[PDB]
Amino acid sequence: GRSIARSMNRKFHRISLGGVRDEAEIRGHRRTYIGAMPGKLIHAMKQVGVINPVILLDEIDKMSSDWRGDPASAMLEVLDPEQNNTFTDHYLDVPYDLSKVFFITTANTLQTIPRPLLDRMEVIEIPGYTNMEKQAIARQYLWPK
Amino acid sequence: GRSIARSMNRKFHRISLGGVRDEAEIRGHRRTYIGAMPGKLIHAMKQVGVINPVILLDEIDKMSSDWRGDPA
Amino acid sequence: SDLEALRKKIEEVGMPEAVKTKALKELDRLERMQQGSPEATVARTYLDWLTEVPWSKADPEVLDINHTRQVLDEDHYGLKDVKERILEYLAVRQLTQGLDVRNKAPILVLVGPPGVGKTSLGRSIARSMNRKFHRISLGGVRDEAEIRGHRRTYIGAMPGKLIHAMKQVGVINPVILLDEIDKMSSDWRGDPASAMLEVLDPEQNNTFTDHYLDVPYDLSKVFFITTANTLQTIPRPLLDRMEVIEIPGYTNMEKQAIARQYLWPKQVRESGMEGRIEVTDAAILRVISEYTREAGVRGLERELGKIARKGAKFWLEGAWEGLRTIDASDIPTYLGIPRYRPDKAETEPQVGTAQGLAWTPVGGTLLTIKVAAVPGSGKLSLTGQLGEVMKESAQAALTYLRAHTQDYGLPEDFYNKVDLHVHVPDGATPKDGPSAGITMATAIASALSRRPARMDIAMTGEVSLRGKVMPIGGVKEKLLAAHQAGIHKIVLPKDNEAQLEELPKEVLEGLEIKLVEDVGEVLEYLLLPEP
Amino acid sequence: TNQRESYLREQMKAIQKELGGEDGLSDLEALRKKIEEVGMPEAVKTKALKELDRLERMQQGSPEATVARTYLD
Amino acid sequence: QVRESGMEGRIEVTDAAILRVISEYTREAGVRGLERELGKIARKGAKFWLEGAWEGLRTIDASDIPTYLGIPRYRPDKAETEPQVGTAQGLAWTPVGGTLLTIEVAAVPGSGKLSLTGQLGEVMKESAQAALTYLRAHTQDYGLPEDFYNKVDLHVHVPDGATPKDGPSAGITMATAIASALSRRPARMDIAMTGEVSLRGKVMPIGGVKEKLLAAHQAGIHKIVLPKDNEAQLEELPKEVLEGLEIKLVEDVGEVLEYLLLPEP
Amino acid sequence: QVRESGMEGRIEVTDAAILRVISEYTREAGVRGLERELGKIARKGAKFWLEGAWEGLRTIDASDIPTYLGIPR
């Protein structure tokens, strides 16, 4: 994904999803106290200056929702960037121009990824390296690091 | 109310005040500026020439306080 | 120049006594040694504003219903309810308690969208009572500075579209095309909505208190026609003294026939070639069914207007052909990809589609609700800026399918295990509860069956908890939406099958309509297999 | 330019000292005649005189003078 | 409207035509929407005369008004409703007045749990639960299995707000829709429902009883279940209203629950 | 009540009448619903005396409670 990011010249960013339990976690919460904040994916536009970065999703295998419903409809909205243009939210209430963002994902366990999010991806299975590969790349980069 | 006006030989200038957010809308304003405007009721009472017309007031059940100063 | 002409166009140019008084007070305010005060300069402007205001130039009016009928018969193809309202607007104008047009009964406000040519109707009313017609625009306007004018104690007072309106027309009783009245807010210096009240009411239009016009104007015999765009955004002082004039929509064949007849001459007059442009009926339907869907035909005016502009562009380079055969070749050349994919590709047989008839404030529409009834923990997951009416529809249809489950081999319990990921692409629908609860019911029944959808059908109707499809209002716009989609099968409730007899049959010719009243009647109608 | 613009503008405010202020005070005279035909409480007459001290502004036709003319309406 | 609208003596309406207009065009408690209806009547008739004075007084009845207005957009005389195999006639009061808030109740199987849909107070749902508790004492005699609070879930939809009155005017309206939904049996026609259940299961006096009798006869509903303490308050009411209103004088919820449940077979 | 309602030497009201009014019409422990009941009774009797000064004292007791008033709540 880092090689992809540089290719499309988009600000690469790191965002994980493990531990989201609530829909209003992905959304914002209501304007009930001083210094209240918008939703998570509108906040994904705060670390970036443009509406097309490369933000790399992580860890949908750790998703479950103890709330009623899933946020996996909001990550299904993430699975179609124009459904992000009608993003339900609370503090900001903004149908955004989230369409331009490049999307790229991670989850280290494909089976415990939920059935809402078990379609329209290709299995990029990336394990480790050998003894000799790690031995080579240590003196190639890591001991030079 | 017009029948009451016709009965007591009164006038009948009704006036609505619905949906009003200000006390400054039912009440008047301060003459120290412009954008200053009376109540609807004050303008209504401007019309008549007697101090006993039937003055009709309209649906205070459907009022609300929204701006600083309760309209009621 | 103007100092001598404006001196003598006060008292021989006929002008009402409410306006002759201010014309004489600016005859006395000006002509003072070429007065150079800023109020005298804006009064030099204002006296020009107040002399070519058209008065003592009425053109002959008719107070019979019979001549009222046939001139609007010449104006339009058909006024199924508007003819009623103009015919009483003139037949009772001679019969009410005042006998003249002094604002007792409401004016002919053309409430609704701007979706028809508001120019040509005003042209034919200027043809009707022999009057003159003028176009204005209160767009961009939310202040007394640009309704009426600025204060008369300095320089900089430009009037608003009212005195521009009744400057650039030439009769006492004009057709003033008041455009974009709906965008109105009271922003500064009190309420400029009360300024259009002063346009509107009987009392303050002859006592027309204006910032630019100190002495009151008379809008006395001034006919008022008004074209706003939205109905919810109009002020209450504008909502004073309103009578409703409706706005209809049209089918594919109706937009085709009117694009041939009633709208093509306006655009080829704007380009300037009457009859040189040929757009065949195949090309007309090619433009219409691939570019326009909604009700308004001023929206349809632009699609032929760009065609007329490109025809003028090809004509200025040289008129090598008197007629140009616009075949199927050159139409994808213009505008590249057309705005709509041709039909039955949104009506592909899909598990997750919702091929039905939803409702938008612009008009009846078709919208595909993305249903993903995945097997999860039965959790109801909804996204899309969804309102509470979406849940009120969704759990109603869900509980109907709770009450109607085992007919199609569905398992004994689903709401505890099937995670509903239903996504309305839009926010919410103002149609009562559901928009078309049977559209999403067919989508969810396709999702639960895992089976693809059907052909040529878009359904409409809301859902009851008792399994009924209650009769819905505004079925005309849904039928127009399906006809505009090329879809010729539309189910309706039984009192909406009585609304079939309510609705005019010129719309209803191109479609076929089935008899349903319960929600399970329509679920068979959007599935490629019967299970 | 502000001197001569103000000089022509004080020719206007001199007419408003002479003719326009008399017309504003004639509006106030008509409504004060309506005061003596219906009959104010004399504190309300005093307040009409008080915002007639806010009025009777011969120096300029102020928006405060307009809103106090609305007040005396 | 004869005087004002230029239709001075040129139109005969029957009151049959006017009640057709009321019953099928605007069911308002007041008559301002019906004054709009009557002005529309005066206008729609008023376009006919100057076309040629074929009549100096045009007789207009239910025969020629569908040329002029149309069909029943609303069911005239709302005594007859939908066959209430799972519902009941709404009978509710609003700021605009008489409303037939016909309660949607889905008595689907499940755990016996509640699920509310609409602007629904939880006190209204506890009134529904008190009615359930009444039917928890009333299972087999009402043709129901003894087990439903463990096995037959609740899904319920009161039109918009449960009751603009704070407190259930429509408590027995909800309850009769619930009972019909449980029984899958027709709640009988003309019988509209106002009142609510006690925890001993009583239709106690309601307050604003006059307004729901207005809500009855504005619909043309002529059958009413009502508390006997409101029978004490019924004689207070001016009987020009109470003409055309057969009223059942209950105190118990079982009295209406043996009344509209007659087609159990 | 009968002084401040202007109802002077015109009605008799027994304590049995007041007993039935309070016991059947308003169960406010303080004197705030009672004044409403009592002004309402004097209101009825004031209207009745307006169409005539017949009796030296209008008879109101516990028996004729639903005559001068609506339903006992």
Side-chain angles (χ1 to χ4, degrees):
Chain A
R2 173 70 268 183
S3 307
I4 291 168
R6 45 173 155 269
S7 76
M8 50 196 49
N9 309 168
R10 295 193 180 183
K11 46 196 62 174
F12 182 92
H13 290 263
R14 218 61 189 82
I15 287 186
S16 181
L17 272 298
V20 180
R21 298 288 180 182
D22 308 333
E23 290 84 39
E25 281 161 348
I26 295 300
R27 303 136 179 71
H29 213 267
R30 284 300 166 189
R31 318 181 56 253
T32 60
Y33 198 49
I34 192 66
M37 321 295 198
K40 274 184 54 183
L41 192 62
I42 296 175
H43 279 120
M45 295 298 103
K46 278 73 176 175
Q47 70 275 16
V48 306
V50 295
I51 60 183
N52 44 1
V54 176
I55 311 181
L56 172 53
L57 187 153
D58 315 297
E59 299 294 326
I60 45 176
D61 52 356
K62 310 297 177 293
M63 293 299 291
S64 175
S65 172
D66 294 331
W67 269 21
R68 195 301 311 280
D70 273 305
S73 295
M75 282 73 75
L76 186 147
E77 271 195 346
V78 165
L79 298 187
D80 175 33
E82 289 82 5
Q83 289 167 354
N84 294 129
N85 295 138
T86 51
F87 171 66
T88 179
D89 203 31
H90 295 243
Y91 176 73
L92 273 72
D93 289 349
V94 177
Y96 209 78
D97 202 2
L98 294 174
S99 192
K100 307 192 178 44
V101 192
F102 178 69
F103 291 160
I104 190 69
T105 44
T106 314
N108 260 340
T109 299
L110 73 165
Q111 291 307 310
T112 70
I113 291 175
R115 192 52 257 172
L117 295 174
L118 267 176
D119 62 357
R120 56 155 155 171
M121 283 74 74
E122 204 163 3
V123 181
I124 317 294
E125 192 65 56
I126 306 303
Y129 307 106
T130 76
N131 306 328
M132 284 73 74
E133 270 151 35
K134 287 158 189 186
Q135 165 203 351
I137 63 171
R139 301 322 290 281
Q140 273 172 354
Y141 167 70
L142 199 43
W143 175 85
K145 195 199 187 299
Chain B
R2 205 171 317 127
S3 71
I4 303 310
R6 187 194 60 242
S7 72
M8 295 299 103
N9 208 0
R10 293 182 58 136
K11 304 292 101 177
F12 171 55
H13 186 282
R14 68 174 293 166
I15 182 67
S16 168
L17 72 165
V20 161
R21 52 152 188 110
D22 300 335
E23 185 50 272
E25 282 164 350
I26 303 181
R27 240 64 165 269
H29 274 277
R30 195 166 68 203
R31 274 151 308 275
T32 55
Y33 58 95
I34 205 57
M37 61 66 78
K40 309 171 167 176
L41 295 175
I42 322 290
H43 174 74
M45 187 66 203
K46 194 271 290 181
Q47 313 305 121
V48 298
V50 291
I51 63 170
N52 44 358
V54 168
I55 294 300
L56 190 53
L57 277 296
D58 295 305
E59 277 80 4
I60 309 297
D61 56 330
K62 299 153 170 48
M63 296 296 172
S64 287
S65 181
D66 292 331
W67 187 67
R68 46 181 199 92
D70 178 72
Chain C
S1 49
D2 74 320
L3 192 75
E4 321 304 311
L6 290 165
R7 182 177 292 171
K8 63 175 176 54
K9 75 195 309 286
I10 282 153
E11 55 266 9
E12 292 83 3
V13 173
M15 187 65 72
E17 304 289 334
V19 187
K20 176 84 73 180
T21 304
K22 29 182 185 160
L24 286 166
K25 95 174 194 296
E26 76 210 359
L27 180 59
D28 308 331
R29 176 67 184 90
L30 306 181
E31 317 292 339
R32 303 184 62 176
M33 284 73 73
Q34 194 69 24
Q35 194 73 19
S37 58
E39 169 75 15
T41 63
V42 71
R44 193 263 315 276
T45 318
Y46 168 58
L47 155 68
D48 190 25
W49 284 99
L50 199 66
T51 47
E52 64 192 358
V53 53
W55 287 99
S56 76
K57 42 191 72 72
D59 285 334
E61 307 171 359
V62 167
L63 283 184
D64 190 25
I65 206 180
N66 301 329
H67 175 267
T68 311
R69 211 172 322 163
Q70 313 303 130
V71 187
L72 61 85
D73 290 328
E74 298 140 12
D75 188 16
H76 203 263
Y77 181 76
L79 299 184
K80 283 167 289 184
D81 276 345
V82 187
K83 172 196 276 193
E84 276 64 18
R85 298 296 87 192
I86 320 292
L87 265 62
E88 300 138 19
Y89 183 78
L90 277 297
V92 186
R93 185 48 79 186
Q94 58 94 34
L95 203 38
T96 61
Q97 304 302 110
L99 183 63
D100 301 337
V101 191
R102 276 307 307 123
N103 305 151
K104 285 192 313 304
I107 45 175
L108 308 168
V109 292
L110 318 177
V111 293
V116 72
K118 311 290 195 66
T119 71
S120 313
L121 55 88
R123 302 191 182 103
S124 313
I125 298 305
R127 294 183 193 102
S128 75
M129 292 326 89
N130 295 108
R131 305 166 170 190
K132 305 204 190 56
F133 161 68
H134 184 233
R135 306 146 305 280
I136 61 170
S137 168
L138 278 300
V141 182
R142 285 148 308 276
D143 50 336
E144 297 162 350
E146 309 155 6
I147 316 296
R148 281 187 298 177
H150 306 69
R151 291 177 313 271
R152 292 279 286 278
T153 187
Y154 51 87
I155 175 61
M158 61 80 71
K161 306 300 291 159
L162 318 172
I163 302 299
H164 296 64
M166 176 78 170
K167 163 189 71 176
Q168 274 145 358
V169 76
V171 297
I172 283 178
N173 44 9
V175 191
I176 286 305
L177 184 63
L178 281 146
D179 292 340
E180 300 97 28
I181 313 298
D182 70 321
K183 52 158 56 58
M184 187 66 204
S185 67
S186 82
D187 193 66
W188 53 282
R189 206 182 171 86
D191 49 354
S194 62
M196 284 74 74
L197 173 59
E198 290 155 357
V199 186
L200 168 65
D201 50 7
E203 60 275 12
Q204 285 274 325
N205 80 321
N206 295 28
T207 301
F208 187 74
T209 55
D210 186 316
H211 298 265
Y212 198 53
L213 289 67
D214 284 339
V215 175
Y217 182 49
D218 70 322
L219 287 164
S220 70
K221 295 297 288 187
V222 177
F223 175 69
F224 310 108
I225 193 166
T226 318
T227 61
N229 315 120
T230 61
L231 63 90
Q232 281 100 335
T233 69
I234 195 74
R236 179 65 179 86
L238 268 172
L239 272 169
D240 172 36
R241 184 183 165 271
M242 293 297 102
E243 62 92 21
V244 182
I245 297 169
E246 307 276 343
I247 298 297
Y250 294 100
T251 62
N252 278 327
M253 71 206 187
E254 280 165 337
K255 290 201 85 165
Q256 180 179 2
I258 295 171
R260 179 66 179 86
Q261 274 190 352
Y262 273 83
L263 306 182
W264 174 86
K266 277 169 75 78
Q267 286 326 291
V268 309
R269 275 158 205 172
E270 289 185 354
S271 62
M273 50 215 88
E274 277 279 335
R276 200 192 69 93
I277 305 183
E278 65 183 1
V279 184
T280 69
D281 288 331
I284 280 178
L285 69 92
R286 161 75 198 271
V287 170
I288 286 181
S289 70
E290 280 180 354
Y291 284 89
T292 62
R293 196 263 303 154
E294 264 294 328
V297 297
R298 183 182 284 272
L300 188 78
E301 283 269 332
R302 210 263 312 155
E303 276 281 321
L304 205 42
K306 59 163 174 59
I307 283 171
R309 284 305 181 274
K310 274 300 282 286
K313 180 250 185 179
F314 282 166
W315 189 57
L316 55 89
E317 295 144 354
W320 72 84
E321 268 155 31
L323 73 165
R324 304 149 168 260
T325 303
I326 301 183
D327 47 353
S329 177
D330 45 1
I331 313 180
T333 319
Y334 311 140
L335 279 88
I337 300 302
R339 297 187 293 181
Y340 301 152
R341 164 73 175 84
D343 58 335
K344 306 307 156 293
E346 52 180 352
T347 312
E348 277 302 313
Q350 301 182 0
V351 181
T353 196
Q355 181 43 250
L357 300 167
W359 188 63
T360 53
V362 58
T365 190
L366 74 165
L367 295 171
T368 296
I369 314 295
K370 179 176 191 178
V371 286
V374 296
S377 56
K379 276 186 316 199
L380 273 296
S381 194
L382 282 72
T383 46
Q385 295 264 24
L386 296 201
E388 280 78 16
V389 287
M390 295 298 102
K391 274 82 71 179
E392 208 160 351
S393 58
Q395 275 94 33
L398 179 138
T399 310
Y400 174 64
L401 294 190
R402 286 181 78 186
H404 186 93
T405 303
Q406 295 303 133
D407 186 35
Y408 294 98
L410 307 176
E412 294 294 328
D413 51 352
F414 64 94
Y415 56 94
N416 52 346
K417 183 215 57 54
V418 174
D419 268 13
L420 272 299
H421 289 258
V422 56
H423 176 85
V424 176
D426 293 352
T429 67
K431 179 61 81 172
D432 292 331
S435 187
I438 69 163
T439 289
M440 283 74 74
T442 44
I444 289 168
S446 303
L448 286 174
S449 69
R450 274 311 91 190
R451 298 316 303 142
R454 258 194 183 179
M455 295 298 103
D456 209 36
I457 179 157
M459 72 291 291
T460 176
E462 307 150 344
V463 65
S464 178
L465 263 63
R466 315 308 315 128
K468 327 278 172 49
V469 177
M470 72 291 291
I472 53 172
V475 298
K476 167 63 73 68
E477 261 300 322
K478 311 277 200 61
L479 282 154
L480 296 164
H483 201 303
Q484 281 286 323
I487 289 169
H488 301 286
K489 199 78 80 162
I490 299 97
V491 305
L492 269 190
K494 301 310 212 296
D495 208 4
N496 292 135
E497 305 294 325
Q499 295 296 326
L500 263 294
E501 288 93 40
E502 273 272 334
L503 284 188
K505 312 295 177 174
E506 301 168 353
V507 164
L508 300 160
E509 189 264 329
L511 316 168
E512 190 173 356
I513 285 155
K514 285 195 270 216
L515 274 292
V516 301
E517 203 271 329
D518 291 331
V519 193
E521 277 158 331
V522 307
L523 294 196
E524 203 265 332
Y525 293 154
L526 207 65
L527 213 64
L528 184 148
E530 56 95 16
Chain D
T1 187
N2 293 350
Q3 161 60 247
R4 294 274 75 85
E5 159 68 29
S6 70
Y7 165 69
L8 304 158
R9 185 163 40 189
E10 62 86 20
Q11 297 158 357
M12 185 65 204
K13 300 289 94 175
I15 303 301
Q16 280 207 3
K17 269 164 192 172
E18 182 179 0
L19 197 62
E22 188 264 339
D23 283 355
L25 197 48
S26 301
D27 173 35
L28 307 163
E29 161 62 34
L31 58 87
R32 181 80 62 178
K33 193 172 187 54
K34 184 177 184 293
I35 295 170
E36 284 100 15
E37 64 86 17
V38 289
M40 296 300 103
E42 291 293 330
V44 186
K45 152 99 178 180
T46 306
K47 285 313 188 174
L49 289 164
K50 161 168 293 302
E51 307 294 328
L52 203 67
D53 306 335
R54 177 152 295 173
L55 272 156
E56 293 180 340
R57 207 174 298 263
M58 321 315 158
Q59 60 89 30
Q60 203 255 336
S62 172
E64 280 202 16
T66 72
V67 73
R69 279 178 322 178
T70 70
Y71 166 76
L72 286 186
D73 213 353
Chain E
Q1 300 283 276
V2 166
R3 177 253 180 190
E4 61 86 19
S5 54
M7 177 197 280
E8 292 93 10
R10 329 186 188 277
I11 293 293
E12 186 267 353
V13 301
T14 69
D15 269 340
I18 304 303
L19 66 86
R20 187 176 188 277
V21 167
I22 296 167
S23 66
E24 306 164 8
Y25 287 90
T26 296
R27 268 296 196 196
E28 190 196 3
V31 287
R32 178 70 88 186
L34 280 167
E35 274 158 350
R36 186 268 308 163
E37 273 299 319
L38 191 47
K40 181 177 71 175
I41 283 164
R43 283 167 274 208
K44 182 55 177 284
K47 68 163 295 298
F48 296 146
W49 183 80
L50 192 61
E51 304 168 340
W54 67 71
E55 274 171 344
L57 173 86
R58 276 88 188 278
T59 48
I60 299 181
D61 63 328
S63 76
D64 58 343
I65 200 66
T67 302
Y68 314 151
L69 265 70
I71 73 163
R73 324 184 317 200
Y74 306 105
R75 168 79 261 163
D77 275 352
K78 288 279 196 315
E80 174 66 37
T81 43
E82 188 194 68
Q84 292 148 190
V85 68
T87 179
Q89 293 179 356
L91 191 67
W93 191 253
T94 51
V96 303
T99 43
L100 302 203
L101 294 201
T102 288
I103 316 289
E104 319 185 12
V105 174
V108 292
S111 54
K113 77 179 171 54
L114 188 149
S115 61
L116 73 165
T117 50
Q119 289 171 358
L120 310 197
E122 323 303 315
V123 298
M124 303 326 187
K125 305 298 104 182
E126 185 63 33
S127 76
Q129 276 153 309
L132 274 169
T133 307
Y134 198 67
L135 274 75
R136 278 185 65 166
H138 296 112
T139 78
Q140 307 296 137
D141 62 357
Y142 289 15
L144 308 175
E146 56 88 20
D147 50 351
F148 42 82
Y149 52 92
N150 47 3
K151 90 167 194 65
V152 177
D153 267 354
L154 177 60
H155 194 274
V156 61
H157 174 273
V158 180
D160 196 22
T163 61
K165 154 193 162 61
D166 300 330
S169 58
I172 68 159
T173 301
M174 293 183 286
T176 306
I178 296 169
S180 296
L182 291 172
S183 57
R184 309 300 196 220
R185 296 318 302 143
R188 297 162 40 238
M189 295 299 103
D190 196 17
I191 332 176
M193 294 298 103
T194 176
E196 70 273 59
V197 60
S198 77
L199 282 72
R200 294 297 302 179
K202 305 296 148 49
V203 185
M204 80 297 284
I206 72 184
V209 57
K210 181 182 68 54
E211 323 293 331
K212 264 80 68 176
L213 276 296
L214 300 176
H217 212 298
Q218 283 149 5
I221 276 159
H222 304 321
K223 280 203 154 193
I224 301 95
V225 168
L226 206 69
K228 181 66 180 67
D229 201 5
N230 295 115
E231 179 64 26
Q233 309 153 13
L234 278 178
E235 61 90 23
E236 276 174 318
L237 307 199
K239 310 299 179 293
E240 309 95 3
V241 171
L242 297 194
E243 293 179 353
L245 293 172
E246 158 54 52
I247 306 154
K248 276 72 68 178
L249 317 170
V250 299
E251 177 44 53
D252 191 359
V253 192
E255 305 179 50
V256 55
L257 274 162
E258 62 95 23
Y259 192 45
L260 283 76
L261 268 71
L262 294 174
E264 275 197 22
Chain F
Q1 173 62 240
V2 305
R3 281 189 339 263
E4 289 149 6
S5 55
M7 188 66 203
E8 277 86 28
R10 299 315 295 133
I11 48 163
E12 67 86 14
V13 170
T14 65
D15 214 5
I18 297 299
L19 170 64
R20 273 212 46 211
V21 175
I22 288 174
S23 72
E24 294 149 359
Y25 270 93
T26 292
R27 275 272 188 241
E28 171 61 28
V31 288
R32 265 191 217 273
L34 279 76
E35 49 205 21
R36 191 257 308 154
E37 294 285 335
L38 183 63
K40 171 181 62 162
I41 292 154
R43 179 71 274 171
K44 298 294 313 308
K47 182 266 289 181
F48 302 142
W49 176 40
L50 188 65
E51 60 257 10
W54 310 283
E55 299 177 355
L57 215 55
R58 296 301 182 279
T59 292
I60 304 102
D61 208 337
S63 86
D64 51 358
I65 285 306
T67 68
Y68 306 103
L69 210 46
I71 300 299
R73 316 183 186 100

